[PDB]
Structures are given as C-alpha cells and as structure tokens.
C-alpha cells in the first residue's frame, strides 16, 4: 500500500491533498467496494470498503480525506510455553503446572458419496490463547509449545471506529476520534484536510509491554526473525495494564507514533520512522516501530517528495501511473556496465540488449527487459555482500546502491546470476518483442485485459502482484481502490478508480468497466456533490423499503 498526505506548505493550492493507493487482493473477503453514504445533516462520506462492512474504510468527506496502510507493528504475541515434565498437555507459569484447556469443534464434511459426515477436532488453549504449530520452527514437543495471544480478539470497537472516522470533520477531529477509541486493528492512518494539515498515525491495537520488561520477556532468537515472541513461563511477561488504554493489555494512544505536519507525510508499509525524514519517529517499543531500512516504494516516494517544489495533484497521480521500477535505479546502471564489459559473451547477449532497450517501467509497452530484470533481482537478493554501498543508517534514503563490481568474486556471481536469469526467461514461452502488457493480465470471463504495474518489491509504486497461470501472469492483488483528493472551494475534488471494478460477478455491467480504464490508466471523477451526481448522464435512482 501507498499513502501520501500533502499539507499547506507544499501543495500547489496551499490546501490539503491526499493520495490513497492501497494494495489489496483482487478477489475474496478483502476485495474493495466503492460507495457513498449520506444521512443528511450528520453523515456524508465517500470511498471504499471491505465486503460485509456497512462503513467506509478508505474515503473522504467535505473537508477531510483519509486512507490506510498495513503497518509494521505487532498485533499479537507468541508465547513460548515450558511444558510440565510429567505431562506435555500441562505447562508451567511461575513453576506451577497448569492444564491446557480443550475446545472441540465439529465440522460437517461432504464426502465423495455426496453425504455428510461429522469431523471432531480438538483445539488446545492456554491462558494466553490457542497453541500453534509451525513444523521445524514452532513445535509442540515434550519440553515446549507455543501459544498465540491475538490483541484484536477483544477489539469489539472496530466497526464503531470506522463509523466514527466516517463522521470526522478535519484532521484534528480524526486524530481525536481514533485516539479515543483505539479500534483500528492493523493499519496506519494518513489524512489531509482542507486547511492544509497532513497527518500520519501509527494508531492501532498493539500488545503493550512496559519498556523495562521487553529485553527480559523477549525470546531473543525469535524476535531477531521479527516474530513478537515472549516468555510464557513467567507471569510478569503478561501484557502490561495501563488504565489509559481503551482495552486491557494494549498500548495507550499517547505511546503510539503520530506525525502532524504541513509539508507531507507518507508511508509504504515500512515503520513510522521515516514518515517524513525531516522529523524522524524514534524511541518506540519494538512491538510498535523500529528503525529499519525502508523498502524501495518508500525510497521512491521520498525521492519525489523531498525538496521545496510545490506538489500538484498530477505529480501524485503520475507517481502511480509512471510505473517506474525504482529498484532499477540502484542496480541497472552497474548491471549495464557489466554487460558492456562482457560484450560477445553469447549467454548474456539477449538479456543485455533487452535491459539497455528497456524504459525501466512496468507499463503495458515496457520491453522484456523488465522480465529479465525481475529474475536477475530474485537471484541478486540471494547474494552476500554484492552492494557497492550497503545500507547506511546515516544515509537511509540512498542505500543500498550499486553493484560492487570492483570485488572480483561479486563480479563473477553477478554475471552468473545474469546468465541464470537469462536462461530462465529464455526457457519460458516469451515470444519475440513481446511486451509486459502481453504477459500480465486479469482474466474477465473468456477475455483478458492487460494490467500495468509490477511487484512492489521492485519499487513499482503501482504495485501489482501476479501468479503464473498457463501462458500468462494472472493478477491477484495490488493497486485496487485509488483516490486522489483535493479541496477546491466548491467541494472535495476526488479522482481515481477501482482497478478490478465494482462487481466480482461476470454477469454484471460493472465486472470489467473500470478494469478497462485501469489498463489505459484513465482515472475518473469520483462524484460527491449532488451537483456532480446529477451531472452524470448514467444516473440511475431507486428507492426501497420494507
């Protein structure tokens, strides 16, 4: 997901502006749906939401626009249990043997014969929550087991939270409403309002441990792999209580990162840290936010956003529609150099030709260089010490960069990586002068629509995730609901698209209409005012009651 909020100090009109570019599935229970909701006098909000929810999840109103991005905060903790030496169904807390609880569920199963049978399954539970088994990682043996405490299981406030956000007037009201209720499960919130404020909040339901407990309560080897794991044999490693938390065991709002600025805030699924590099967010719980190298989507956005030049609506739109493969910026120049150094090496010829002719984008017309580049990067990622300039904590926007071609072993490995990548691309059924758009598509009935964009791990802001299905890459997730909002005097001006269209049903007039538009990158007005709605020549109206 991407989000950028621009404030009065940077926007071309001196007012708030918001780009919402969430990256979510194209199917299933998280498929975004557009709607505008109005109770005249007290609610008027438009955007998109998840299936089955009678609230707007990402949207805008008269003076406010907001959006969300999956955060890097922990929303659960694992608990390593010490098992009773006499009984692996018992576990020790403060050296006392407690029995596991057993909860059985019964499932009906349609057999081969079309008939139902009853399957009974036992779910083992500890005081923390249910046991979980990851074979070869989190086992249940005779000395240890792992249980999982999910912080959102007691979050009954989630729906009220979005209804409340839907009623928010401006950025300060939004902040109040989100900090008071703490109903947000697992996303950041970024927002801008008419008066030109830009807000980032890392305000979600996050397990709370007082700072002096963390080093002693952590399972050191598991936290190093990024798992929030705690010592479950010690009662003092229970989540801490703070009467200011909206829910017992969760982090108080005052302790979660917030940035209020008039220039910009951004997030691309990295931590709060470099939301705006001019004002780093630091000193938070490791369950909350850590200072880790940012992904290339964030690096890309910061390279466009830092500086003193005014930001237009078009600036932000084009950050998505450019389809620029930002990871190319770090490696392609040195990669092309290595290509020139090995001219007349038969194995590398086609790859280097394709790469040097490539527009560095994931556009429909982008050359096969993108395909060669992806497969190389997949191998590059597995190499040790191949960066010319490794990540530098003092230069976090500009590192890692370049290939260490001066180190002879690296040069050998990078070339072999390129040969291997070339081979894989050449083995596959890619035609001659076939383009990215010929390969990446979304199926609609018996037809196919070319989809621009590419994997966000390659720094394409317009992130698109695809899987191999037969002769094509089939899009499964990424850019989904797009909204870009500004605030001219008349009322909110909102622009965007729902990439995969309103309806998942092939029989619908709205199964592929916005998908056609997404293909051509033709964003549309999101009509909000009665006037905008009445100006629509396709306007239909139905009233219903029972």
């Amino acid at each position: 997901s991407n989000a950028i909020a621009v404030g009065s100090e940077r926007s071309a009109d001196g007012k708030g502006m918001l780009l919402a570019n969430p990256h979510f599935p194209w199917n299933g229970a998280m498929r975004f749906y557009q709607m505008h909701l109005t109770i005249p006098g007290r609610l008027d909000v438009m955007g998109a939401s998840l299936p089955g929810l009678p609230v707007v999840n990402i949207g805008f109103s008269r003076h406010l626009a907001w959006t969300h991005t999956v955060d890097t905060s922990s929303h659960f903790t694992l608990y390593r249990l010490a098992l009773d030496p006499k009984d692996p169904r018992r576990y020790l807390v403060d050296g006392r043997s407690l029995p596991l609880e057993e909860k059985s569920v019964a499932i009906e199963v349609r057999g081969a014969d079309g008939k139902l049978s009853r399957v009974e399954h036992k779910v083992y539970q500890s005081i923390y929550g249910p046991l979980v088994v990851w074979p070869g990682k989190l086992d249940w043996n005779r000395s240890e087991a792992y249980a999982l405490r999910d912080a959102n299981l007691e979050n009954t406030r989630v729906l009220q939270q979005w209804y409340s956000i839907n009623q928010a007037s401006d950025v300060a009201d939004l902040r109040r409403r989100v900090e008071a209720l703490q109903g947000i499960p697992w996303v950041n919130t970024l927002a801008a309002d008419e008066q030109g404020n830009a807000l980032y909040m890392n305000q979600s339901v996050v397990p709370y441990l007082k700072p002096e407990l963390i080093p002693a309560c952590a399972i050191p080897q598991l936290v190093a792999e990024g798992l929030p794991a705690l010592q479950g044999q010690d009662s003092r490693c229970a989540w801490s209580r703070d009467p200011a938390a909206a829910q017992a065991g969760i982090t108080p709002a005052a302790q979660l990162p917030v940035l209020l600025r008039r220039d910009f805030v951004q997030n691309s699924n990295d931590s709060a840290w470099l939301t705006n590099p001019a004002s780093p967010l630091q000193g938070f719980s490791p369950l909350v936010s850590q200072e880790k190298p940012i992904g290339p989507r964030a690096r890309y956005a910061l390279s466009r956003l830092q500086g003193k030049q005014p930001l237009e609506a078009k600036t932000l739109e084009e950050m998505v529609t450019a389809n620029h493969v930002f990871s190319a910026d770090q490696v392609l120049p040195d990669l092309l150099r290595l290509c020139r150094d090995n001219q007349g090496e038969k194995s590398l010829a086609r790859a280097c030709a394709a790469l040097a002719q490539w527009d560095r984008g994931a556009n429909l017309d982008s050359g096969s260089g993108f395909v060669y580049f992806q497969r190389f990067m997949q191998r590059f990622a597995e190499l040790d010490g191949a960066w010319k300039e490794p990540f530098d904590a003092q230069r976090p926007l500009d590192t890692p960069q370049g290939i260490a071609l001066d180190r002879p072993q690296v040069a050998t490995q990078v070339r072999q990586a390129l040969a291997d990548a070339a081979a894989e691309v050449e083995k596959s059924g890619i035609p001659d002068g076939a383009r990215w758009g010929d390969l990446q598509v979304s199926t609609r009935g018996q037809e196919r629509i070319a989809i621009p964009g590419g994997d966000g791990h390659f720094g394409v802001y317009n992130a698109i995730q695809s899987v191999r299905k037969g002769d094509h890459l089939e899009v499964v997730g990424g850019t989904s609901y797009i909204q870009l909002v500004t605030f001219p005097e008349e009322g909110p001006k909102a622009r965007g698209l729902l990439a995969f269209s309103q309806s998942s049903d092939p029989r619908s007039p709205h199964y592929r209409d916005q998908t056609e538009l997404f293909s051509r990158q033709q964003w549309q007005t999101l009509p909000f005012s009665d006037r905008q709605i009445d100006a629509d020549p396709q306007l239909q109206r139905l009233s219903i009651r029972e």
Partner: protein, 163 residues
C-alpha cells in the same frame, strides 16, 4: 420494518445511499452490494461460518487459499456462539442498526434476484444472511493481522505421542 433507503448509482455502478438513520443506510448498502457481489459475500460467509467442507467437500480451498476443512476448523473456533454474542452485546445501537439494515437489504435483493447480476442463483449456499454472519465476517477481518495468519498452525497444534 422502518427500513427505507434512497440509492443513486453514477457511472461504473457506484452507489450513493441516502437514508434518515443507520438502519435505512445499512438497508441501502446491503442491497446495492448484493446487486454487485451477492455470490462473493455468500462464499465468504460460508468460509466465515466454517461451512466450506459441508458444501464443497475437503478437496477445495477458500479464497484465502486455505484447505476447506482446516479453514472450517479455524472459523468454527473463531466464531463460536459466545464470541459472536459477546461481540454483539458490545456494539453500539448505531452499529447494530447498520448491521441489521445491511442483512435485511442483502436479503431483499436475494428475494428478488433473477440472475441478471448473480451467477450463483440456485446454489444451496446462496442463502438469506443474518447479523451474526456479518459479525463472522468482521471477526475474520479483525484477526487478519494476528491469529488469522496462523490458522493452519492452530489446526496443526497437536500434543506429542510416544516419540
């Protein structure tokens, strides 16, 4: 009853629901959403009710790509009656009304549907929905950043034998 909505659709099937209260607003939302996505919701409700294996057998997967039976076990555990009931009793009147409207609006579309925009008309799993179903969907989304990511791990958690 006391359910009323005014719905406008603009280009691309975007609904604009106007109502005088949460109940009517819910009613419009569920009706409009059902028009575009009745089958999706029905499928995901089946998943969230832990009824995949009942309708589809053990050889299929949910849209989250979990095997039907492990998925069912996880959702049957997650969405037990007491969890649903506690969750409901914690909802504000406004939210309760939103959900009641939605269920009622979805079911109204189901009553009237003739297949114009619904490909799963006739399937035994396309059924009238209840507020509990929306709570099931909500809770499934709630744990997407927690125990949801360990659904398989939970189903697999069994004590050691004689090894």
């Amino acid at each position: 009853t006391g359910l009323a909505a005014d719905i406008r659709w603009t280009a691309y099937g975007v609904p604009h629901i106007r109502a005088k209260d949460e109940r009517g607003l819910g009613y419009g939302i569920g009706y409009a959403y059902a028009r575009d996505n009745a089958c999706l919701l029905a499928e995901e409700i089946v998943t969230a009710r832990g009824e995949r294996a009942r309708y589809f057998g053990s050889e299929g997967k949910s849209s989250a790509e979990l095997d039907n039976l492990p998925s069912d076990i996880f959702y049957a555990w997650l969405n037990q009656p007491e969890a649903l009931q506690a969750f409901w009793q914690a909802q504000t009147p406004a939210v309760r009304q939103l959900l009641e409207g939605y269920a009622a609006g979805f079911n109204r579309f189901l009553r009237e549907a003739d297949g114009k925009t619904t490909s799963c008309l006739g399937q035994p799993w396309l059924r009238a929905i209840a507020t509990d179903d929306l709570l099931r969907l909500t809770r499934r989304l709630l744990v997407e950043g927690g125990v949801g990511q360990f659904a398989d791990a939970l189903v697999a958690a069994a004590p050691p034998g004689a090894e």
